[PDB]
Amino acid sequence: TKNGRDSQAKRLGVKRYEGQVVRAGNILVRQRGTRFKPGKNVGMGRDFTLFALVDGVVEFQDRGRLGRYVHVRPLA
Amino acid sequence: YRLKAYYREGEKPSALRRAGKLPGVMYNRHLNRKVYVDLVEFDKVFRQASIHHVIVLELPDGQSLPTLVRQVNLDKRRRRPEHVDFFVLSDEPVEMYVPLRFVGTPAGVRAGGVLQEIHRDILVKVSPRNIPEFIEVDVSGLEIGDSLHASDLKLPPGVELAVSPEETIAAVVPPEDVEKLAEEAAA
Amino acid sequence: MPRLKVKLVKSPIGYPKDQKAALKALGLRRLQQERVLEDTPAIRGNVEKVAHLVRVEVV
Amino acid sequence: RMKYRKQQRGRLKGATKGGDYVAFGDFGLVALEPAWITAQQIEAARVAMVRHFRRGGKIFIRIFPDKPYTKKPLEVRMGKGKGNVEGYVAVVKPGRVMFEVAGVTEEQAMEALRIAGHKLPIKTKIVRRDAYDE
RNA sequence: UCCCCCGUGCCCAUAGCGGCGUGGAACCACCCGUUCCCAUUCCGAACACGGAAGUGAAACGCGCCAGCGCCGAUGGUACUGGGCGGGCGACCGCCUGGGAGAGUAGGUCGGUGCGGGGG
RNA sequence: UCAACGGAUAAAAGUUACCCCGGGGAUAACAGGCUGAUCUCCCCCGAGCGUCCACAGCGGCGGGGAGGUUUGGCACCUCGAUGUCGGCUCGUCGCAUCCUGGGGCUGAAGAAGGUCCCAAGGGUUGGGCUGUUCGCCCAUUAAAGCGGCACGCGAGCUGGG
RNA sequence: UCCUAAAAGGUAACGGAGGCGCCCAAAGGUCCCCUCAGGCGGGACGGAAAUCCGCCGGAGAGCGCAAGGGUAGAAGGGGGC
RNA sequence: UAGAGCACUGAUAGGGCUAGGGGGCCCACCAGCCUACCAAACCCUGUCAAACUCCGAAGGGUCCCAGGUGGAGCCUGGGAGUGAGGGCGCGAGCGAUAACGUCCGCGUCCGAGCGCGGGAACAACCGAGACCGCCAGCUAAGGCCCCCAAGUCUGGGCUAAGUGGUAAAGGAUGUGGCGCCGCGAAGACAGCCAGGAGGUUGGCUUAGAAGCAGCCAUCCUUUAAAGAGUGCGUAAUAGCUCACUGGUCGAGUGGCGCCGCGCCGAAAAUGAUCGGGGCUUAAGCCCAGCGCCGAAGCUGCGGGUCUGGGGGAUGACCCCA
Numbered sequence A: 001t002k003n004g005r006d007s008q009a010k011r012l013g014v015k016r017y018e019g020q021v022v023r024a025g026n027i028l029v030r031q032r033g034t035r036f037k038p039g040k041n042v043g044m045g046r047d048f049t050l051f052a053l054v055d056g057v058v059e060f061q062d063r064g065r066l067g068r069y070v071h072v073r074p075l076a
Numbered sequence B: 001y002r003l004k005a006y007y008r009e010g011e012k013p014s015a016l017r018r019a020g021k022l023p024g025v026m027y028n029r030h031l032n033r034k035v036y037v038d039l040v041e042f043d044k045v046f047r048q049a050s051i052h053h054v055i056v057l058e059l060p061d062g063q064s065l066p067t068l069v070r071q072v073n074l075d076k077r078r079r080r081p082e083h084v085d086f087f088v089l090s091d092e093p094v095e096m097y098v099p100l101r102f103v104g105t106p107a108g109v110r111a112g113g114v115l116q117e118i119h120r121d122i123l124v125k126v127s128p129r130n131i132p133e134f135i136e137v138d139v140s141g142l143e144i145g146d147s148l149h150a151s152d153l154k155l156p157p158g159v160e161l162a163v164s165p166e167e168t169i170a171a172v173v174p175p176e177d178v179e180k181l182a183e184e185a186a187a
Numbered sequence C: 001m002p003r004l005k006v007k008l009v010k011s012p013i014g015y016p017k018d019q020k021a022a023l024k025a026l027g028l029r030r031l032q033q034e035r036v037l038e039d040t041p042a043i044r045g046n047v048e049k050v051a052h053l054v055r056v057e058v059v
Numbered sequence D: 001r002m003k004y005r006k007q008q009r010g011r012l013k014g015a016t017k018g019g020d021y022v023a024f025g026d027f028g029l030v031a032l033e034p035a036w037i038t039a040q041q042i043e044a045a046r047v048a049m050v051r052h053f054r055r056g057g058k059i060f061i062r063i064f065p066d067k068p069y070t071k072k073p074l075e076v077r078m079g080k081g082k083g084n085v086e087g088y089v090a091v092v093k094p095g096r097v098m099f100e101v102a103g104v105t106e107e108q109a110m111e112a113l114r115i116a117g118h119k120l121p122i123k124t125k126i127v128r129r130d131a132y133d134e
Numbered sequence E: 001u002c003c004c005c006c007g008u009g010c011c012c013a014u015a016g017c018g019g020c021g022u023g024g025a026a027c028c029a030c031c032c033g034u035u036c037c038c039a040u041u042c043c044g045a046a047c048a049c050g051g052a053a054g055u056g057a058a059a060c061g062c063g064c065c066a067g068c069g070c071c072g073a074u075g076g077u078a079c080u081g082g083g084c085g086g087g088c089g090a091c092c093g094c095c096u097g098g099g100a101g102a103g104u105a106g107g108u109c110g111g112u113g114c115g116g117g118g119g
Numbered sequence F: 001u002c003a004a005c006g007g008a009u010a011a012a013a014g015u016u017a018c019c020c021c022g023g024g025g026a027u028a029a030c031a032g033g034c035u036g037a038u039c040u041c042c043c044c045c046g047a048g049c050g051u052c053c054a055c056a057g058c059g060g061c062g063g064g065g066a067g068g069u070u071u072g073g074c075a076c077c078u079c080g081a082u083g084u085c086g087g088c089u090c091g092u093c094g095c096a097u098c099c100u101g102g103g104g105c106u107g108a109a110g111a112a113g114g115u116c117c118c119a120a121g122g123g124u125u126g127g128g129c130u131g132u133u134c135g136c137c138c139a140u141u142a143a144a145g146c147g148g149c150a151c152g153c154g155a156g157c158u159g160g161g
Numbered sequence G: 001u002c003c004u005a006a007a008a009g010g011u012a013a014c015g016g017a018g019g020c021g022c023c024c025a026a027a028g029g030u031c032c033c034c035u036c037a038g039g040c041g042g043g044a045c046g047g048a049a050a051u052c053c054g055c056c057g058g059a060g061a062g063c064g065c066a067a068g069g070g071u072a073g074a075a076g077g078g079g080g081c
Numbered sequence H: 001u002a003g004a005g006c007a008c009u010g011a012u013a014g015g016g017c018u019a020g021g022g023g024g025c026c027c028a029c030c031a032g033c034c035u036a037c038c039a040a041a042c043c044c045u046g047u048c049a050a051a052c053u054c055c056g057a058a059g060g061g062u063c064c065c066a067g068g069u070g071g072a073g074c075c076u077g078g079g080a081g082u083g084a085g086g087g088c089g090c091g092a093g094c095g096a097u098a099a100c101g102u103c104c105g106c107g108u109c110c111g112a113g114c115g116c117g118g119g120a121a122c123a124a125c126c127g128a129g130a131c132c133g134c135c136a137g138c139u140a141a142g143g144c145c146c147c148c149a150a151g152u153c154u155g156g157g158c159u160a161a162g163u164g165g166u167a168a169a170g171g172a173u174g175u176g177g178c179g180c181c182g183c184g185a186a187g188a189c190a191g192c193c194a195g196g197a198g199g200u201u202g203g204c205u206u207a208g209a210a211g212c213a214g215c216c217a218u219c220c221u222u223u224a225a226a227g228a229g230u231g232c233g234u235a236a237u238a239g240c241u242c243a244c245u246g247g248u249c250g251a252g253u254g255g256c257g258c259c260g261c262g263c264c265g266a267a268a269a270u271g272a273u274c275g276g277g278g279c280u281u282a283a284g285c286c287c288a289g290c291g292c293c294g295a296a297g298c299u300g301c302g303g304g305u306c307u308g309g310g311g312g313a314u315g316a317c318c319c320c321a
């Protein structure tokens, strides 16, 4: 009875939460599409991954119709 | 209709029900108060009263108030009221559902059939001054398969409807029977 | 604030691991053991969980 | 009907939404106890009701069977039941209104709505219509 | 300090839809033309350039309206960490802390930051 | 298509009732157990049938349950062995009673019968066919009951299957 | 790919459902431009549905293929290099 | 996610509205009008969904800050065993809302606590984590009539079945308690005496259909009263009867709904039984309250050991946790 299939879990989601120090360029969120958009010092790769471009702390922000953004508020 | 209210605050609604006091609220654009009538009492009243007829509430402040029943939430599982709402009226154009007397037995009812009274009341804008105990309906020119919408109404003075001009009030429908069974179970 | 006295009375046996650890943090070794300590927000937090196993006095 | 396929069982926790109030009709029948009511069970009550007052008023049916009923043909363990043997059912939790009658006298509603209760796997109750609305 | 308009950002529908009224003096639009810069899978529609005359019609700014959209309590219940009791069960009840969705009362035709022209 | 996709060789299919060793009740077949869908019985409702008349007698559609004889599900003791159908001998227990005893109802004139209730005390035949159980049949009877006891009974027997 | 999976991640059964073993020198990079589906009305052949004009129409289209997530403030359609 | 919701995908009962279809009158020029039919779209009413979500908890997850010295935590390294698990509570799939069934998730106990008290007996249910000794003490669950420690304890109810001592739809003037409705001293409920009627024989079908098979249904008259009729009955009547009024009588009475305990439904195989005997204002059930018995739990006293600390220049050894 054909059905025993499935794919292996991809383990994705936010990796670093709001108010968390981050090193140069470590990943912050792995997402299916654009559940989140870039931000201050926060670029995104082919798989829509979101990673830091600088050190400092991560902060989230909901911009309604705009989207949900995530960025690093640096310091040094 | 009249009814004696009582003031409430921090006590447990659950505990009140234990004694026999049904909790509820009273409010309008300016008022809002934690209250509770006696169940057995409210029942006698609300049964007769309903959300069509006004109620005079009587607080221990000597205060009388012309409150309409807004909504009553029930205990699913063996029906029974849990908690009430009282809209304190004043003198401005308020809307509210008001009764409906379908007088006269339509052509269908006569020739065997069923009066399906879609509504039993109508949402209509109105002044606290106006509270037509009902609204008669000449439903008698109704043949089997016919209907009566809002557009046809005996609307008393100052009583404009809030609903649609299309929304139907009632209708006559065919009567299910045993001869019907032969056909149903077959096909 | 007042220090809390807390005596253990019902055996923690069979009770979920978490609470096992609470009685540990509250320094509650064995049963029927007395234990007086400061009433801080975080101290109560533990004494809170283990309520069903301890009676709290006030001193 | 359409939907899709076979469906998991799921439990029948408290009769929360399991219930309602009398919509149409003069009287009705409420479930006191949770259960899966079969298609057959339903029709059983229906046809009963009509048969009682021949050429009668109007019977409403507030419940409706959409859960697929799986079952195995007297075997063991490969795959999920081809199911559908009793076919389909309706999730009736304590409180729910199942049938409305209208256009008849009490002694008719009482009797018919009672006879129907004899086809249902459940303890039930027949309601007038108090007044409690909305 | 204030008011009008212009460009820009912010909160992201209480800002929106529609209805009604309103301003061209400055601003903005439309309008005149297409030689030149440049442009249409065809059309100066659009983008682009030169430029008075006309206009506030369209667009837009402003304001009033709630009919639609949008926001929306209170009380109360569902459910529920943690603790306890009951029925063979399908299940149900109590204590302690938490507590909606829906619906109701009601709110809304926005608010504000910077810069520039205009009295 | 090293696709048996972490890929044993470069290079490979059957059969054993002629069979054998190591292991397993970690796992089937018997039986027991748990369960009771299937099975057997009882019951609720009463459309309808029975001239009239829902229960003399009967009961659609659907509902609740008892029992643990069948078919089955699971895999729990038992694979350093718990012998398996049928017959024979000897039985013994249940009662949902086949007969005899007692009783209500009857669409019971009488005789005879229908059906329900009480009631194990004792009784419950001989032969043909088949390994048979089961069943059909012959001739009788008050009747030729059903079922439990490892589908009782192989340190009792048989050994047709 | 989705559900089961109990709002972190994970999570089983001969549990419920469906795909993959490719394709594209443009279906790729960039610069500029552009915005659907669908509904009503008007239109010679057409005709429910070609193409044309109007209005309404925030994403129900589209994104080579399954499904989901995303998405017109482009990832969608056109062009130049 | 539970919940809830219907705005997307689908599902859905009833009605409104309205394309296409069905069927009749009316047609051939094709058109129209009906429709107690089928039905898209749209609307209101009402609802369902693991793989639907406009919405959405308790909670969980992670970072920061603080408490937290614990047979905690981290790092390197030597040594392993284990890779059949099992039951219970909860949340799902499978299963049949079967299984001492199965498969995951969280927890837990057995495993290894078949050691100790409770549950008659019984790994995992309730109580509790056994270092040894004691003819000491408090308590846990459970229990206090005898076997068997300790109350035939106190107070207020209920149950008459041995219910308790462990079965379901469904049933019934079992009994107790609360509530609403109506009747009655201008005389109720019951019983009991009289009428209980007239067109009527209601109309329609049917062989027949006279309140009284089946179908449709709502008159008035004599009156204080008697249904176009309750049930029997005859082939069809009459009949008797309730309904219905008036008298006798003399005080209460009928019903609806909620709650507590009990009754029927209730049939098995070696001999019975709730562990037993026994128990009925209880030795049962519900509420309240004081006391006591009861473990290897805790306290008291003594000893052992190991760790930690303090005394010991001193080791030895001493005290304390």
Ligand SMILES: [Mg+2]
Residues within 6 Å of the ligand: A003, A004, A005, A006
């Ligand atoms: Mg799988």
Ligand SMILES: [Mg+2]
Residues within 6 Å of the ligand: A006, A007, A008, A009, A010
């Ligand atoms: Mg996956």
Ligand SMILES: [Mg+2]
Residues within 6 Å of the ligand: A006, A007, A008
């Ligand atoms: Mg997996």
Ligand SMILES: [Mg+2]
Residues within 6 Å of the ligand: A006, A007, A009
């Ligand atoms: Mg998955």
Ligand SMILES: [Mg+2]
Residues within 6 Å of the ligand: none
């Ligand atoms: Mg009037």
Ligand SMILES: [Mg+2]
Residues within 6 Å of the ligand: C018
């Ligand atoms: Mg935790």
Ligand SMILES: [Mg+2]
Residues within 6 Å of the ligand: none
């Ligand atoms: Mg000790």
Ligand SMILES: [Mg+2]
Residues within 6 Å of the ligand: none
């Ligand atoms: Mg079923």
Ligand SMILES: [Mg+2]
Residues within 6 Å of the ligand: D076
């Ligand atoms: Mg098998």
Ligand SMILES: [Mg+2]
Residues within 6 Å of the ligand: D026, D103
């Ligand atoms: Mg009516």
Ligand SMILES: [Mg+2]
Residues within 6 Å of the ligand: D026, D104, D105, D106
């Ligand atoms: Mg009525």
Ligand SMILES: [Mg+2]
Residues within 6 Å of the ligand: D117, D118, D119, D120, D121, D122, F063
């Ligand atoms: Mg029934």
Ligand SMILES: [Mg+2]
Residues within 6 Å of the ligand: D117, D118, D120, D121, D122, D123, D124, H169
């Ligand atoms: Mg029932």
Ligand SMILES: [Mg+2]
Residues within 6 Å of the ligand: D117, D124, D125, D126
């Ligand atoms: Mg009932």
Ligand SMILES: [Mg+2]
Residues within 6 Å of the ligand: B072, B073, B074, D021, D132, D133, D134
């Ligand atoms: Mg309501």
Ligand SMILES: [Mg+2]
Residues within 6 Å of the ligand: E001
């Ligand atoms: Mg100044």
